[PDB]
Structures are given as structure tokens and as C-alpha cells.
Design a protein around this ligand. Structure first.
Ligand code: SF4
Ligand code: NI
Ligand code: NI
Lengths: 313, 708
């Protein structure tokens, strides 16, 4: 036969998150994910672990049992995760900032983030709330407090991209996630707005949306396939940016992963279904063109890291 | 002394003062003494921007005087004048740097002197997001303290960051202006050279936010001209040094406004004696727009309130309908005829009808002016006016042109709702949504029966003529740019709609004019310009640029396309089309079927069966999904013979386009009743039956050349 000679004219750009020896690189591939037989896969996809600035009340009981004496203090929580599981990066989700719940001033949350970033070596990704209006004020204060560590600000949608991008990349020399809603054109639009504002592809990463397996999952898969093919096959300069998809945010909130044995006796264990839900979701998005995923359960990280290592080595 | 000589004289005086103060620094501190500004990474920003050199000791400060000397070339050309302004800026920076060398703290409060880098990063985010609309550099002295306080507080109330140089600092203190970084009133210093401290803010904005390396002077000047919305208000008598420093502001793209008689330069150096208009003059000169957060109406305003129902017995006033005459109009007029935020109620107000619910004439004339506002955007503004009025509680507007009628509920009136509030809603959000094409908006609400009829005949009726004539008489040959829409790629990734004046979108809701306005309002939106450059084939609609721009938008899925044919590289279809035309080879023509038609076409396939192959953004020769208006177009299959290829249409569909289809076929010279020759569902449904019907009818499609 004839070996498939697939030549792509594009190449994904590299974004560096963090500082020091623990800084990680994203992107750089000129072929489809895990296609070591086609060419150069730039940087191995990274796996990150999620923590909260408040005590996790809605997390499953097995997760609460792991983080017993460290969940109360985010500073202790971040150091516990770094020393025990050594994640590529730690995601700090500011749950206390959302107006829908225990709404708190942006100054309070930035003070929490300041202590965390100065207590760990691993790169930090500060995840904001769902509200576009609050994230503009929240990230302005957070990026000011945590200056000099090159954090990643997450969820900068078209609404607040001016506020988040300015207070992020341009002012305090951080990285920003440009988030769209499971569309290539919307992903292409937000990237153009960042470029026109003065932020080139090396300073922001892309979030084309994420979903749990079985809950609008094929929409995320199609978007990831389309952006990867356009960036490489069509040499689209406005899509040659690395992609980060938070899996634990969506995969761990579903009925199939949160229901315990009391609620659904036939479904079996709860911890197994929670880990199996994140592993399935993360593996599928990794194969579609995601350069970094965020996971919650420590066991999911070990499986995904082995999953990445087996395919690349 | 002309403008050039005044600037050169000022620059020489600035150089003379810089040399004198540098000599003092050398004599008192020596050339090894450190030179620095408090808390900055850019050394002396102006010199670093112009040359890329960082100055650290006094000896290098003395060597920076050669930069000032090399920037003063006394030749009366504009470039030399701008360089001489920059010479004053460099000299002023050297003077300020020597101030910090000579005296440990050279500025005493309220003056702040140099502005540190963390402050710039603190106010940089509001500068990018527009929370700070601009920077008002006020220097000199006003005729009185209250005049200065009024102007300064006017800028402050508008959210602008104002910087103060000279005696206006004392005048503002006498006028009791609250000064602070959070209050956006920063006094820099009493000396003219202190204006360099706001100049370095713009320079370091290019260095920090623009990411421009030092020494790239042209890039930095370009950045400050486009990105930093700064302007200068020079009050009181102006010395040559002040004028030369102003030439430095002009060199950075900052217009200079003054109350003094000067050799005015359009858009750059302007005289405005009227202190009551200086703020508005500066905002116009710097293209600064201030946004209004709140609609100034007592009745609640939200998108949720539309679609409500006013009880038949709880109406207050019913304007328009078949009852009385009501109309609306959006005009594109010159800036002279439009005065910003003018609401005029002509006739009795709503408070006059205290009796039972009655009817009054209503005339809503809206005048809009802007730099890039044209007559093609008027329908877009007028369409949105329907939803603007429906968003108000107790007010519901339905209709267009003179077919409109608005009813007012009791709930609004008891809360002080008046006809003046009608113009407040339109004006406040006409500037909001159409913030890139509407500069000024003037709204007049006419309710006098005599005037309502008169103004309609001179503004409303004549302008509706232009809208209809423009839409009807515009053809593909006249236009020079097509438009491409890709809003249906969410489910048909390979689909690109090419919109021409004679071929609108498949969904039928996007036309050439609509896409033209979509591109203007939303430059990064779904509609983008498609140049009609490079004509491979005129009859089939093949263009070199169209093929280039289709393969780019579709991400390479579709490379070659035609606009006026269905056999050779046809356009793709998404799935929003209401009518699909399919080729019928045995009849030497094509068959059509609409979405609502649930029976079987003579092709043997229903609409659903045909839509399963035509749609999805795939190029299927012989089948094309299109709109309901494209049927009666002169470009409907121009390359396949023309309009006469239609042989079978649904009875309901044929009636709808019968008037337009017959007129278009009249250009083909056949008898006018072309729809009479077209077979329908009632006559027959099978292929062999319809062919016999066409044989007896003398249908033109049979006589034409073989389509396939
Ligand atoms: S059919 Fe209409 S909405 Fe869809 S892509 Fe074409 S113009 Fe846009
Ligand atoms: Ni469509
Ligand atoms: Ni469609």
C-alpha cells in the first residue's frame, strides 16, 4: 500500500503558563493529536487538578474523605495537592465570587489567590465565575494581587474580553483564556478581537467549550475537530492557539457521576462512576485536539497521565 | 512671528533651560551621580522611546542635550515642526529629571510630579475598556476660578482623567475641585515642563500595553495617536515655550485646544473662546464618546416587557391605526441639521387627554447624523425602533412606516410618562446599539393633526419611495462588492452564502442591504465583503475572488462555485431554505417545491427526501435550495437558460409569486401569463402527465437547448 502522507501547513503556537522550572508549554503540534506517526506533536498535553477557595460542599463523599484536613484552607489544599499528586497545574476556582451563591467582594477573593500563588511552585490557573459582569471586576483585582507569577486567567468571553484581557495579558503580563461556546466561528471571532486589542497568539489560549460525555458531547468533539483541521490544514493564523478544556467542571456534575448507591443501587459504586466519567470525557477531548485538561479526582489524573504516556511513548 | 517660528523659539528656550539646569546638576552632584525617576522601569521615558537608551547618571543626562539639538531643524515644513515639538518634550523631560537629581522631593502636594509605573498599570485597564473616555490635559490659567472649576468638574463628571499644569491647580483649589487619583483630577506641577509627566503616561502606555520596544519612535507616535485619547486645553496667554510644548502634543497626535488666538490647524490646533463649549469642542476634536448607562425614563425599561397586553379598558391613548394616522421615519441628515439630544413634542401632550381613552395623530421623526452614516442604513435603524418602543411597560408599538400605531397604558402615565420620554428612549439607545455609525440623534414627536400630515408628505412619503426604488432597481452589475454569510455553519460547516442584490440568502431573512449594514455594525460578524474582482465567466457567475473567498470561509471544503447555475459547481445549501428547485431531465427543465408542501413532486421525491441531499453544505449539481423571493429574479438560473426552465410548482406557491414571476418572464418576451403555462399539483403529479401538459401548452422550456 501507500503510507498516508498527510502534510499540514499550519502549526499551533506555544503558550507558557507559570514561572520557574515548573512552567509548562502548550501547543506546538503540526499534526493531529497522538499522531506520532504523522509528524511532530509539539508538547505533551498537560493534566491539571481542581481546587476550591471554599470548602467543597457539593463534592462526592469519597472526594471529601481525601481532602479532610486540607479542604478548609485553600493554601493548605494547594500545597497538599502539589506534594501528593504533583499536577502539571492547579486550577483555583473562585466559587465564593459568584453572585448566584455566597457572593463576595473581588478584593476578598484576590487575597485568597495571592496566598495560593505564593505557596506553590506549580503554575496556577485561576478560574472565575459564570457571570460576565463579575469576572471583569474579579480578574482585575486578582491579576493585580498575583503579579509576577504568570497565572492563567480563565473564562474571558466576548463580553468582558476587553476588561479581562487588559487587566490580564497587557497590564500584569499574565495569560488569558479566550472562551467561546462550542463554535469554530465564535472561537475564530473572539481570537480576532484579542488580536485587534493587541494580544497575539502567544499570550492567550482558547476554550472552545466543554461538556460531559452524553450531554452535548458531540458538539464539543466536532468543534475541536474543526478548529484543529482549520488551524493546520488551512493554515488559519487566527486558530493556531492551544486549547484548554475543563473536564472536571462539567463531567463531575452529572447524575451518572454524583448519584450514590442509596439513590441508584444498580449503578454500583459512586467513586468508580465519578472517575470513569472524567476519564472518558478527558480521553475523548484529548484525542480531538485539547492541549490541557482539568480533573478533580486524583485517580482520574493517574489514568489520564498513563493514557497520555502510553500513546506518545 | 508665525507658527513655525513660535515653535522653534519655544524649543530653543526649552533647550536653554535644559542646559542651565543640567549644568547645575553637574556642578553640585557630578557626572557620576545617579539619574532616575521614582518607580519606573523605562528610565526617562521620552528619551527611551525616541532612542532606546536608558539614562542612569548625570553625565548621560548632559549627553541627552544632543538629542534636543538634533531635533530642532529650523525649516518651515510640517515634519520639522513636529520634530521641534518633540525637542521640547525631550528638553522638558531632562529638566524634570534634573529636578529629582537636585532636590530629593521636588514636588510638594497637591502636585504629584512624576507618575510611577504601577499607577499607569492601575489606570491602564480603564483606558483600554473605555471606562476612562479620554485624558484632558489642562494647562495655563482661566479668566476666573469658577470657569476653571466648571470645566474641570465637567470633565470629571464625564469620567475623563484630567491632569492640571500651572495656575489652574490653584484656580481649581479655589473652585473646590476634589483632586485625587481615584477622583481623576491629577495636578502635575506649576511649571510648564510638568506637562511631560502626562506625556510619559502616553509614552509608557505604548511601552507597556502596546508592546513597542524603545527606539521605535514612529510606532510609539502611531500608538499614542490611535490608542491614547488625550487632548490639551491651553488657557490664558501662551508663551513660545507653551506653543512648542503643544507642538509636542500634536506630534503625539493629541489635538491642542485654546482660548487664545492662534494660527489654527484643522483637527490639530483649534481656538475656542466660549468656555461653555470647550468640553464639547474637545470631545469632538478627540472623537471621545461618553456612554449613558440609564435611560432617563421613570417607567421601567426592559426587553422582557415587550409582548405584553394592555387591557382593552386600561388603555389611555391610541395613536394611529385605521383610527388616526401615525408614522415613523429615520433620516440620515447633515450634522448641521441634527442637534444632539433634542426632544421636541409638537402638539398636545399626553397630559391633555384626561377624558376617556381617545385617539391622537402621532408623528415620530428621527434625524440621525454621523461620519459614516448613509441612506442604506436607515431601514436597519427604523426596524429596531419597533423593539425600542415595545420594551417600555405600558407601551406597545406594531407596524412600519405610516401603518404604525402605538397605544399607551394608564400605568405609564400615572408614573409621569410623557411624549418627551418617547424621544429619550430612542436617543439613549440609538447611540447605544448604533454607536459606530450614529454620532448625533434628534427626535421630534409630532401630534398636531396639521403638522403630522404635512411632515409626512415632505419627509416620510418621499423617503419610502427611495427605499422601494433602491431595493427593486439594484442588480448585480451595478454593485461592485458581494457579501458572504456563515451563520448556518453551526450545522452545515461547508456552507457559505453569497449574497447579491439579485440573490438574497437561502433563509430569505438576509439581503444585500442587510448584509451591508451587518458588516458595518459588526465588522467581525457573519457578513463580510466579497470583492467582485476577476471575471472568469460572466454568464455562469464565475469570479476569481469569489472562488478564493469561498474556499477560505468554508475552510477548503468548497473551492469552485457558480452563482447563476445549478449544474456546474452550484452553491451549497444549509437547511433553512423554504423552496428547493430540482432538475427534471425528461421535461428539459426544473421542478420546484416549498417546505410546507407535503405531497410528492413529479421528481418522485418529497421536500423532506430532497432536503436530505441538497442540504448540509454539499455541492449537489441539479438541485438547489433557495429562498421564496429568488424565484422571480432575473438571475434565477441565468446560466441554465433562465427563468423559463420552471415547469412545475405547487398551487399555493405559484399563486404567491404569480405577479412577480409573470413580470419577470415578460422580459423573456413570452406571453405575460407564464404562471398559466406552469403546471401545478392540481393538474397533474406524475412525470409523464406533466410532460404532455407542457407539450400542449407550448412551454418555452421544451424548445430551449438541452439543459443536461
Ligand atoms: S442562509 Fe441566511 S442565516 Fe444561513 S448562512 Fe445564509 S445568509 Fe446566513
Ligand atoms: Ni442557512
Ligand atoms: Ni439552510
Amino acid at each position: 500500500f501507500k503510507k498516508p502522507t498527510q502534510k499540514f501547513s499550519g502549526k499551533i503556537g506555544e503558550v507558557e503558563i507559570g514561572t520557574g522550572e515548573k512552567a509548562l508549554k502548550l501547543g506546538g503540534e503540526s499534526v493531529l493529536p497522538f499522531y506520532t506517526f504523522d509528524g511532530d506533536t509539539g508538547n505533551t498535553p498537560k493534566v491539571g487538578m481542581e481546587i476550591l477557595d471554599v470548602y467543597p460542599e457539593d463534592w462526592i463523599d469519597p472526594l471529601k474523605d481525601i481532602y479532610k484536613d486540607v479542604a478548609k484552607d485553600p493554601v493548605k489544599w494547594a500545597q497538599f495537592v502539589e506534594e501528593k499528586y504533583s499536577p502539571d497545574f492547579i486550577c483555583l476556582r473562585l466559587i465564593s465570587a459568584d453572585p448566584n451563591g455566597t457572593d463576595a467582594a473581588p478584593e476578598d477573593c484576590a487575597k485568597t489567590a495571592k496566598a495560593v500563588v505564593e505557596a506553590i511552585k506549580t503554575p496556577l490557573v485561576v478560574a472565575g465565575t459564570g457571570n460576565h459582569e463579575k469576572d471583569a471586576k474579579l480578574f482585575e483585582k486578582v491579576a493585580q494581587e498575583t503579579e509576577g507569577h504568570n497565572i492563567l486567567l480563565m473564562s474571558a468571553v466576548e463580553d468582558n474580553y476587553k476588561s479581562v484581557g487588559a487587566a490580564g495579558v497587557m497590564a500584569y503580563n499574565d495569560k488569558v483564556v479566550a472562551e467561546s461556546s462550542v463554535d469554530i466561528n465564535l472561537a475564530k471571532q473572539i481570537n480576532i478581537l484579542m488580536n485587534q486589542l493587541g494580544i497575539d497568539n502567544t499570550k492567550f489560549v482558547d476554550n472552545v467549550g466543554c461538556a460531559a460525555g452524553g450531554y452535548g458531547y458531540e458538539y464539543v468533539i466536532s468543534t475541536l475537530d474543526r478548529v484543529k483541521l482549520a488551524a493546520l490544514g488551512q493554515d488559519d493564523k487566527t486558530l493556531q492557539v492551544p486549547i484548554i478544556s475543563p473536564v472536571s467542571f462539567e463531567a463531575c456534575k452529572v447524575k451518572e457521576a454524583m448519584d450514590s448507591e442509596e439513590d441508584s443501587p444498580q449503578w454500583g459504586s459512586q467513586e468508580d462512576r465519578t472517575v470513569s466519567m472524567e476519564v472518558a470525557t478527558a480521553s475523548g477531548v484529548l484525542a480531538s485536539g485539547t492541549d490541557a485538561v482539568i480533573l478533580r479526582h486524583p485517580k482520574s489524573v493517574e489514568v489520564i497521565r498513563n493514557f497520555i504516556k502510553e500513546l506518545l511513548g | 512671528m508665525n507658527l513655525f517660528q513660535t515653535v522653534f523659539t519655544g524649543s530653543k528656550q526649552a533647550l536653554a533651560a535644559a542646559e542651565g539646569i543640567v549644568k547645575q546638576a553637574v556642578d553640585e552632584k557630578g557626572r557620576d551621580y545617579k539619574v532616575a525617576f521614582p518607580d519606573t522601569a523605562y528610565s526617562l521615558p521620552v528619551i527611551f522611546a525616541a532612542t532606546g537608551k536608558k539614562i542612569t547618571n548625570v553625565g548621560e543626562l548632559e549627553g541627552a542635550l544632543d538629542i534636543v539639538r538634533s531635533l530642532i531643524v529650523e525649516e518651515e515644513m510640517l515634519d520639522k515642526l513636529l520634530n521641534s515639538g518633540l525637542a521640547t518634550a525631550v528638553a522638558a523631560e531632562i529638566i524634570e529629571a534634573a529636578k529629582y537629581v537636585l532636590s530629593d522631593a521636588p514636588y510638594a502636594e497637591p502636585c504629584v510630579g512624576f507618575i510611577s509605573d504601577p499607577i499607569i498599570r492601575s489606570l491602564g485597564v480603564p483606558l483600554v475598556t473605555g471606562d476612562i473616555p479620554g485624558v484632558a490635559v489642562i494647562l495655563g490659567e482661566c479668566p476666573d476660578s469658577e470657569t476653571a472649576a466648571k470645566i474641570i468638574k465637567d470633565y470629571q463628571s464625564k469620567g475623563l482623567l484630567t491632569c492640571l499644569v500651572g495656575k489652574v491647580i490653584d484656580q481649581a483649589i479655589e473652585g473646590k475641585v476634589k483632586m485625587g487619583l481615584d477622583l481623576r483630577v491629577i495636578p502635575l506641577g506649576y511649571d510648564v515642563t510638568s506637562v511631560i509627566h502626562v506625556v510619559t503616561i502616553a509614552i509608557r502606555a505604548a511601552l507597556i500595553f502596546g508592546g513597542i520596544k524603545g527606539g521605535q519612535l514612529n510606532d510609539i507616535l502611531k500608538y499614542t495617536a490611535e490608542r491614547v485619547p488625550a487632548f490639551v486645553n491651553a488657557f490664558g496667554p501662551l508663551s513660545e515655550l507653551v506653543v512648542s510644548a503643544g507642538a509636542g502634543a500634536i506630534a503625539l497626535g493629541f489635538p491642542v485646544l485654546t482660548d487664545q488666538v492662534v494660527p489654527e490647524v484643522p483637527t490639530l490646533l483649534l481656538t475656542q473662546k466660549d468656555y461653555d463649549k470647550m468640553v464639547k469642542t474637545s470631545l469632538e476634536a478627540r472623537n471621545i464618546k461618553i456612554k449613558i448607562t440609564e435611560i432617563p425614563i421613570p417607567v421601567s425599561f426592559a426587553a422582557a416587557f415587550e409582548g405584553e397586553r394592555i387591557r382593552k379598558n386600561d388603555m389611555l391613548a391610541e395613536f394611529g391605526g385605521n383610527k388616526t394616522k401615525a408614522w415613523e421615519l429615520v433620516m440620515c441628515a447633515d450634522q448641521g441639521e441634527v442637534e444632539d439630544h433634542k426632544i421636541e413634542v409638537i402638539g398636545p401632550d399626553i397630559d391633555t387627554i384626561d377624558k376617556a381613552p381617545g385617539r391622537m395623530p402621532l408623528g415620530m421623526l428621527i434625524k440621525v447624523s454621523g461620519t459614516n452614516m448613509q441612506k442604506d442604513f436607515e431601514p436597519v435603524l427604523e426596524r429596531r425602533l419597533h423593539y425600542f418602543l415595545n420594551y417600555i411597560e405600558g407601551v406597545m408599538h406594531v407596524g412600519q412606516r405610516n401603518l404604525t400605531w402605538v397605544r399607551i397604558g394608564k400605568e405609564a402615565f400615572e408614573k409621569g410618562f410623557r411624549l418627551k420620554h418617547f424621544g429619550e428612549v430612542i436617543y439613549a439607545k440609538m447611540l447605544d446599539e448604533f454607536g459606530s455609525v450614529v454620532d448625533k440623534c434628534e427626535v421630534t414627536i409630532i401630534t398636531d393633526p396639521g403638522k403630522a400630515e404635512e411632515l409626512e408628505g415632505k419627509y416620510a412619503v418621499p423617503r419610502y419611495k427611495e427605499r422601494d426604488a433602491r431595493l427593486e432597481s439594484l442588480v448585480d452589475e451595478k454593485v461592485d462588492t458581494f457579501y458572504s454569510c456563515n451563520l448556518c455553519q453551526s450545522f452545515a460547516p461547508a456552507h457559505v452564502c453569497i449574497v447579491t442584490p439579485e440573490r438574497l440568502g437561502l433563509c430569505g431573512a438576509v439581503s444585500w442591504l442587510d448584509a451591508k449594514a451587518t458588516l458595518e455594525l459588526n465588522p467581525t460578524g457573519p457578513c463580510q465583503a466579497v470583492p467582485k474582482e476577476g471575471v472568469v465567466d460572466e454568464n455562469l457567475g464565475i469570479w476569481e475572488k469569489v472562488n478564493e473567498t469561498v474556499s477560505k470561509i468554508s475552510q477548503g471544503a468548497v473551492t469552485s462555485v457558480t452563482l447563476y447555475s445549478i449544474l456546474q459547481d452550484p452553491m451549497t445549501s444549509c437547511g433553512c431554505f423554504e423552496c428547493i428547485t430540482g432538475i427534471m431531465p425528461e421535461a428539459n427543465g426544473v421542478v420546484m417545491v416549498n417546505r410546507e408542501f407535503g405531497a410528492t413532486t413529479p421528481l418522485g421525491m418529497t421536500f423532506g427526501e430532497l432536503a436530505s441531499m441538497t442540504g448540509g453544505g454539499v455541492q449537489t449539481p441539479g438541485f438547489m435550495g433557495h429562498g421564496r423571493q429568488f424565484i422571480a429574479s432575473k438571475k434565477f438560473m441565468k446560466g441554465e437558460g433562465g427563468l423559463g426552465r420552471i415547469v412545475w410548482m405547487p398551487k399555493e406557491l405559484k399563486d404567491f409569486v404569480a405577479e412577480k414571476l409573470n413580470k419577470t418572464a415578460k422580459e423573456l418576451y413570452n406571453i405575460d401569463n407564464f404562471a398559466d403555462m406552469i403546471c401545478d399539483e392540481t393538474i397533474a403529479t406524475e412525470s409523464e402527465e406533466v410532460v404532455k401538459f407542457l407539450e400542449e401548452k407550448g412551454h418555452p422550456a421544451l424548445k430551449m437547448d438541452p439543459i443536461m
